[PDB]
């Protein structure tokens, strides 16, 4: 029956020399990519955590990394005010994306992987051409740093979030705003992403709350609480390979897993020794990756039987 998951620690991935900022599984399921304040990207085996390579070139720390759909490219977002596009097999920087005027905080490819979206401390969202490395559009999107950016499943929409308390949905082709989601209040919105069915947006706010939104109708459907999140922009996820969960890091050093429908906490994963800034869910297997800040600096791989 829909039984609770039993995620258990299988591997701990050491090697970053400063806080880890982001981990992401490759769409083909083979790899995990991590970014860090240490200015490095590392690649690891998705199933056994095996260290594969280090990818270097940024001049300052990296806050986010993201895969192309074919698992061959990565893009990274850095305090050096650039994004870089990387060929994962060679480790070579293909393009440096220049235009932001402050730290680049978040990034993603669209599904066709001909575009990249970025968000920055400069309060803008930018849309970039992967082939040329040119900025196509600069959106005056927010009135505070942009914490997250994500394309929907056909690349026609971008969702963005900001410390200004807004979540906005943009038309990719024109760069114009389709919708602003605001609630009864405007705590900072620290993370957003579209759901695997394209229908919902998951949004984190720095009042220790996650919310599931129907974005067509513009309304909140579910609220998830019990974790600690008032300071950091922590990644959250839909887990869909087994039971239907919401997964998030927490400032009490735990990974939280909720039942998406009932909103109950079903598991808390103990082991990290600093804020769990990032979690990710494997595309086909019941595997979670988590990563933590300065006092820990490791990535952990957890596996469940369901």
């Amino acid at each position: 029956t829909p039984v609770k998951p039993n995620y258990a620690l299988k591997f701990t991935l050491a090697g970053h020399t400063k806080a880890v900022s982001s981990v992401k599984f490759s769409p083909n399921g083979e790899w995990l990519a991590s970014s860090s304040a240490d200015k490095l990207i590392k690649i690891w085996g998705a199933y056994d955590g095996k260290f594969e390579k280090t990818i270097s070139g940024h001049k300052l720390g990296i806050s986010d990394v993201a895969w192309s759909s074919d698992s061959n490219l990565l893009v990274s977002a850095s305090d050096d005010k650039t994004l870089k596009i990387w060929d994962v097999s060679s480790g070579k920087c293909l393009k440096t994306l220049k235009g932001h005027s402050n730290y680049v905080f978040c990034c993603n490819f669209n599904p066709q992987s001909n575009l990249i979206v970025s968000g920055s401390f400069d309060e803008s969202v930018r849309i970039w051409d992967v082939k040329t490395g040119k900025c196509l559009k600069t959106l005056p999107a927010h009135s505070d740093p942009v914490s997250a950016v994500h394309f929907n499943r056909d690349g026609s929409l971008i969702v963005s979030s900001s410390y200004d308390g807004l979540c906005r949905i943009w038309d990719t082709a024109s760069g114009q705003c389709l919708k602003t989601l605001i609630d009864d209040d405007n705590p900072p919105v620290s993370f957003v992403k579209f759901s695997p069915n394209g229908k919902y947006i998951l949004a984190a706010t720095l009042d220790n709350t996650l919310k599931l939104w129907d974005y067509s109708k513009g309304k909140c459907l579910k609220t998830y609480t019990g974790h600690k999140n008032e300071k950091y922009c922590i990644f959250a996820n839909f887990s869909v390979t087994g039971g239907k969960w919401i997964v998030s890091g927490s400032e009490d050093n735990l990974v939280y897993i909720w039942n998406l429908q009932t909103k109950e906490i079903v598991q808390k994963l103990q082991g990290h020794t600093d804020v769990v800034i990032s979690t990710a869910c494997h595309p086909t297997e019941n595997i979670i990756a988590s990563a933590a800040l300065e006092n820990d600096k490791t990535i952990k791989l957890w596996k469940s039987d369901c």
Binding site: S21, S36, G61, P145
Partner: peptide
């Protein structure tokens, strides 16, 4: 990494 508390975003 700006992502890796409160002080930078309020500075």
């Amino acid at each position: 990494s700006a992502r890796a508390x409160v002080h930078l975003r309020k500075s």
